[model samples]
Target: SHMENVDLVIDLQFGSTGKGLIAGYLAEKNGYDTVINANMPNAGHTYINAEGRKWMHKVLPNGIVSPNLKRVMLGAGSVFSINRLMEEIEMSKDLLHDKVAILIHPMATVLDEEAHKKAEVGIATSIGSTGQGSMAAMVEKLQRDPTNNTIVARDVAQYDGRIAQYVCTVEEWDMALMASERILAEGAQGFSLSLNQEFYPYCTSRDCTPARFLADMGIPLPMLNKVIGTARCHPIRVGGTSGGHYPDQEELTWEQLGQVPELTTVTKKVRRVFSFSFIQMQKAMWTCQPDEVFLNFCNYLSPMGWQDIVHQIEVAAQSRYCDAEVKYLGFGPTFNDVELREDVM
Candidate 1:
C-alpha cells in the first residue's frame, strides 16, 4: 500500500510526556523526513541524541537524527525566536548540519525583542496559556487583517508594523500537501490550551486540534487517518496566558495526580513535578477524534506495588484489562524506556 496519508499523528498532554522522545525515535528510525509542529511557537521541545548531546529546540522538530529526514517547522503563522534557533542548530550541529536538512518557509515571522518581551508578560496570563513566548503575540495578533491581507509575512518583517503583520504564514498549511506520503505531524501542547474549547480564557492562542491541523495544513478529508489519543493520567499546567498571570501552580502540586506509569527520566527533569490535570483528557479526545488511545506517564508505576490500585480504578471506570489487546505501555524516559519495544533504546 502506498502511504500517501499521514502514517501517524500523536496528540500529547500539555508539554512533557516523553512524546518528543517517542516521536523522534520513530521518525528517525522509520526514515520519516517531514514532521509538522502544528501548534504555535510556544512549548518548543528539548531532546537528547545517542551521543549524549543535549538540545533545546523551539519552533523546530526534534527528530534530527534520521540522516535522510528533514525537519520542517511550519512556522509561517508561528512566531520565530532567532536566539532559540541559533542555539538549537549549534547544539545539534552534528545531527542537523550535514545529515538532517531544515526547510523553513520564507514567510515565517521572526520573534524579536518585542515578541519576546510580550511573551515574558504573556506567559503569566491565561490568554495565551502557553509558554516559550506566545500569549503576547496572540493578543496583539488579533487586530491584524486575516490571511495575509495586511499582516502578511512581508508585513511582519517590518519593524514599525505589529507582529500581527504576519498572519496565516500557513507554513504547516503548505507542508500538509507535501506530507501526503508517509509522515508524522507533531502536536505541540494539548487540546486544553487551544483557543476554541479551552478552559474559558485559559488556553493557547492557536488551535491544537487535529481538525485545525487538517484545516490549516490542508489534509484532505478522504485522507482521514487513525488518531492516537495519548492520556498521561497526570497533566501539568505550564506558563499561563489568559491575563498575563502565571497561576501560582506551586500550591496545586503534581502529587495529587493519580498513579503515574510511563514518564521518561528526561521528562521528569523539565516537568513541574506537580499540577497534573487528568480532567483535561476529555477535551483532547472530542477535539481530535482519536481512533485509538495510548496511555502513558506512569514510568515509576510498578505492577508489584500498583496492581491492586490499577484493578480498583479499572473496575471503577468499567474498563476491561487485557494485556494483548490493550495498548502497549512505556516504563521510563530513556530512549529505550518502553515496556514492549526493547529496541526503542
Candidate 2:
C-alpha cells in the first residue's frame, strides 16, 4: 500500500529544531524514492551533508539529497515565491536527472510579493512575522474567489510556459504516489508554532502536527509508517515580540549559554533563546506522539545539559505513555555531526 511506506519528519519545539538535518540524513540513509514538502516562506530548513555542503530549503524538500530520489512533490498546501522556487530548482540542477521529476500540486499557492507583504505590514511589526507574504497568500487561497483574482499553481500566469513542466494535476500526483515505493514527507515549523496550539495570533497560518502535515501532502492515515519529531536542547523563537516560550522556560542570552547568537533564516533577525522546557516537551509528546525523536543542537549544550535534556525528554515520553525513543542526536550542523543516541549515550 502506498500509505504504508510513508515516513514523516516534524518539529517538536517552536520551529528551527534541525528537522531538515534529520530529513536529509534519513533520505540519504534510507534512500527514499519520493520526497514531498508543504513549505511556505515563513519557515526555513537547513541540511548540511557530510562534506559540509549546505542547503537551506524554504520551498524544496531536504530529501532532494536522497541518492534514490525519483520524484519531488510540492504539496497542495505549499505557498511559495516563483523566484525562490526557480532559484532552488536551479541550485539542484546537477542533482536532477531527466528521469527525476519535480511535480507541483495544482492547488499550491503562488506568492504575490508586493500585495501580500503590503497586507501583512501590521502583523509583521506586531508579531515579528517573517513578512514574506505566506500567511497573506494562504488567506487569499482560502478566500476561494476567482473574482478576487485568487491564483493557484495551475492557473498562475507566472508559471505559464516557464514552470508548466513542473505542474501536475491531482490525478498525476495520486498516480506518482501510488507508484512510489518509499515516501518522505518533510514538515515545516514546529508543533508549538501550530495555529491550533495555544500560541493564537502569534502562530503560523497552519498547524504543524504530523496529522496536519499528512493532510497537507494528501497522504492517507494508513500510509503513515513513522513520525520522527526533531527538537533542540535550547529552543528558540524568532527575535522580537514574536511570542512567549513555555511558562517553565525563561528566555536566556547567548552570553549565558556561552554560544554565538542564532539568527532567523528569512528575516536575519537575532533569535531569542530559552532553556529546555520539559513542560513544552511533555505537551508536544502528548499531542504529537512521535515514534522517534531527534534531539539537535547538542553542540550548543554542555555534556551535562544535553544529557539532562535527553533524560527529561525520556521522562516526558514515559509520563505521556508515548513510546518514542531519542534515536538520533545532533551535535552540530553537518551530517557527520549527527550520531545514534545509543552510540553516544
Candidate 3:
C-alpha cells in the first residue's frame, strides 16, 4: 500500500529543534498510514496541535496526529520504560481503540528500575543523561545472559492483556512493512549531538541520522523517500550542567532572546539558549543530507530580524548543499503558526 515511499523527520542541531512540531504537522497533512517511534524515553517531543493541545511524546511517534494512521510501532532499536509505555498507552487509549494498532518488536529492551539506578550512578550522570535508562537498557540487552529471561515487550505484556497482542517479531514487522502504504519514521535527538558528532558527552547515547532512525524501525534503506531535517534559530541545551559551547554560539539569556527561558520536559532544568550559528547550520546540512529543512524558532526573532536570519542561513547552506532546501518556516509554537515557504519559493 503506502510502503512504496517513506518520510523521515530528524533534528539537524542539538535536541530541542522543534522536530516534533514538524513531524506532527507533516503527518497530519499527509495522512501517512504508518508511524514508527524509534526514540528512547530519555528525550521528549512536544507537539502543539491546531486546538493548542500539547502532546509531550516521550515514547510515541508524533505521527499519532496523522488522520490516516493505521499502525504505530516501537521498533527494535527502541529502549522503553514499562511504566512510561503503559502510561502513554493509557493516555492515547482513545486513538488506539478501533482503527489503529500498536506493536513493539520482540527485541526492544524494557527499561527497568535497575537500569535507572545504573544510569543515575554511572557515566550517564557525567554526560547529562535523563536517567530514563535508555543507554542502560541498551547495555543490558547487549550483555544479557542467554538463559536469563531478559525482560522485553513480551514480558511486560503479562501485566496488561492488551499489550500482549502487540508484541511481535522482526519478521512479522517486515511482512507488515511490505503490506503498508506510507510510513513515517520519527527520530529524536539531533545530528549535532550524535554520539559520533562533536557534541559528545552532552549528546544522547545513540546516533540521530535518517539511516539510524530507519534501522531502529527495521526499515531498509531503499524505502527512504525523504528526510525532513529541523533546526531552530537559537539552539538550546537542557538546564543544569551541559556540554561546552561553540565559539559562535555563546550563552544566550532569556532577556537576550526576548523570551523566558524554558525547562526541559523530563529534566525540568533550565534550558540554555544560544545565538544562531551559521557554521553549525552549514555543517549540519551537509551531515544530515536532508531533502528539506524545517526552520523553527523564528518567533525568537523579530519578524524582520528572523527574515534576515533566514536569509543568512540560506546563503551559507545553499553554497554547501545546493540540493537541500529550507522550505518550511515555523514562527510560533502552535499548529497554525507555520508558513509554507515552498508555496512562495
Candidate 4:
C-alpha cells in the first residue's frame, strides 16, 4: 500500500480556532516540502513563530514557515485579490525568493475587489461576511463565461507581469505534488461554518470537510495521510446576525471569561463567545473523525475548565467510535505556547 504523504489541518469548530498556530508548528517539526492552501479571502490564518514574528495569511499557506519548504501551491478553489497576494509575497520575500516556487492553479478565481465587495454588502451586514469578495468571485468563476467578464488566474492581464511567473497549469501542479516527499494541506474556516452542514443559508459557500478540501486542491483521497483538527476551548462566531450556536450552547460575554474580547482576524469585529458545547463537539467528531485534535485557547480557561472540556471531548469521541485523540494543547498564540497533551496532563 502506498500513500501520497499529505497531512491536512482543518478547523472543527466555528472559525478562528488557532489552526495557523498548529499548521506552522507541524510544518517546522515535520519539515514538509510542499505547502498547499485553497483559502478564500473570507478567512484569515495567523501564525506566530518562536521569534514572535507574526504572519496573517489570507491567501498564503501558513506552512511557509517550514524550513524545508520548497513550494507553495494555491489550489483551484481559491478566490483571492491580487493585491493581497502581492502584499503577502512582499512581506515574506526573504523566505520566498528565487529558491522557492509559488504555484497558482490556472482556474483559480481572481477577485475584482470593487465589484465583489459591492455585491456582498447585504450579506456582510446580515451574515457577518468578511465582505472581501470571496463568495462573489466564486460565483463569477462558476459562471464560466469569459464574455461575461469572468477572470481566472491565467487570464487576468493587469497583474500578469507580476504574477505570470507563478501561474502554473493543472499538470504542473500534479508534477510538483509528485516530486514532494511531504505535503501539508491547510484548510480554511471551520466545520460548523460549512454550507453543507446543518447551518444552511447562514453558512459559507462550500463544505469545509477534508473531502471537499481535497477536491479543491485536486488531491485524490488516497493521498490523505492524516487529519489534524483544531478547536478552541470556548467557541466564538463572528459578531452580528451570523447565525446560531449549537442548541445546547448559550452565548457569553468576554467579561464572563475574565479575558479581553477577541476580534476576528479578517473582519476586525468583536467576536460572539459561547460556552463549550459537548453537542457541537460530538457533531464535529461524527462528521470529521479526525485522527488528532488541537485544543486551543486554553489560556482563557482555568485548568479545571479546560480539563473538563477535554474529558467531554474524549467521551464524545468514544461514543461516536471515532479514534480522534486530543494530542496538542494551545495555551497561547505563539509556537512556544503549544504543548504536547501528554506533557501537560
What's each prediction's TM-score? 0.68, 0.97, 0.92, 0.97
Expressed as tens digits, the lDDT of each residue in 1-345 for candidate 4 is: 466699999888888999889999998899898999899988888999999999999899999999998999999999988889999999998878788999998888888989998999999888877778889999998887857534788887335676688888889998898887899999889999999888777789999989889989888788889888888999988888888889999999999999998987445689999988888888888887788899999999988988888788888878888888899999999999999988988
- Model 1 stretches astray by more than 4 angstroms: 1-4, 7-12, 49-51, 97-101, 119-132, 138-142, 145-176, 216-218, 221-224, 239-279, 292-294, 304-328, 341-345
Alpha-carbon lDDT, every model = 0.48, 0.88, 0.77, 0.88
Q: Please tell me which model should have the higher lDDT, number 2 or number 3.
A: 2
Candidate 2: tens digits of C-alpha lDDT, residues 37-80: 99998878889999888888889999999999899999999998
- Candidate 4: list runs displaced more than 4 Å: 148-150, 157-159, 265-267
Candidate 4: Cα lDDT at 64: 94
Query: Cα RMSDs of all predictions?
Result: 6.9, 1.4, 2.3, 1.4
lDDT of 4: 0.88
Best of the two (1, 3) by lDDT: 3
- Looking at model 4, report the run of 10 residues with the lowest lDDT sum: 155-164
- Candidate 3 lDDT by residue in tens digits, 1-345: 343478888887777888789888998889988888778867788888899878778788877888888888888888776677778877777766678878888787777767555766554457666677787777777776765355566665667564578888778888777766888888898777778778677777778887778888899888888888788888887665667666687888988777977877545667888888877777777767777778898877776766776676677667676366778889887678777866533
Which candidate order results from sorting by lDDT in descending order?
2, 4, 3, 1
In candidate 2, position 228 carries an lDDT of 90
